[PDB]
A paper describes a structure:
The atomic resolution structure of ErpC has been solved, showing the formation of a β-­barrel, an architecture which is completely different to the pre­dominantly α-helical CspA, which is the only other member of the CRASP family for which the structure has been elucidated. Several of the loops between β-strands could not be built in one or both copies of ErpC in the unit cell owing to a lack of electron density, suggesting that these regions are conformationally labile. However, ErpC lacks the additional structural elements that are involved in these assemblies, suggesting that it does not multimerize in a similar manner, and analysis of the interfaces between the ErpC molecules in the crystal using PISA suggested that there were no biologically relevant assemblies. The observed molecular mass of 17 000 Da correlated with the expected molecular mass of ErpC (18 316 Da), confirming that the protein is monomeric under these conditions and, in conjunction with the PISA analysis, that it is likely to be monomeric on the spirochete surface. The solvent-accessible surface of ErpC exhibits large regions of negative charge, which suggests that ErpC may be acting in a similar capacity by binding factor H via interaction interfaces reserved for host-cell localization. The binding site of complement regulators on ErpC is likely to involve residues within the loops between the β-strands in a similar manner to other bacterial factor H-binding proteins. Mapping the sequence conservation between ErpC, its paralogue OspE and members of the OspE/F-related protein family, including ErpP and ErpA, across different B. burgdorferi strains reveals that variation occurs mainly within these loops. These findings suggest that ErpC, ErpP, ErpA and OspE share a common architecture and are individually tailored to binding specific complement proteins with different affinities.
Numbering used by the authors: 38 to 52, 56 to 80, 87 to 179
The structure:
Amino acid sequence: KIEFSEFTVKIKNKNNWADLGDLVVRKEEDGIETGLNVGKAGYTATFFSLEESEVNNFIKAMTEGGSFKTSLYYGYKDEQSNANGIQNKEIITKIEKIDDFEYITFLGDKIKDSGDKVVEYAILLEDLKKNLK
């Protein structure tokens, strides 16, 4: 039984690690929807969504490291997937230390006009651990 409803965590990206914005995580009837808020208002859109059957994988991946399948992935402005989405994309997470602090890190999609150069995201592990229940 999932207890969470909606929460917000700060999200970082690669330039060096830099602050990007807020990631809103919502528990829907079927699965989870994540939204990205960048700047002030500013940019506000779906980041990725996943089905009910992938909720347990998502919770384990976002608190321990692992993988989960999204039903739809958009990412941010610099990704190829932003305009039209990518279906069934697998997200692989790792726990990495950034300035003596543990983060959940994952790769996004390819950058718009770059030779398989991919975006990387980071979220504070403690922020996810305390919210995902």
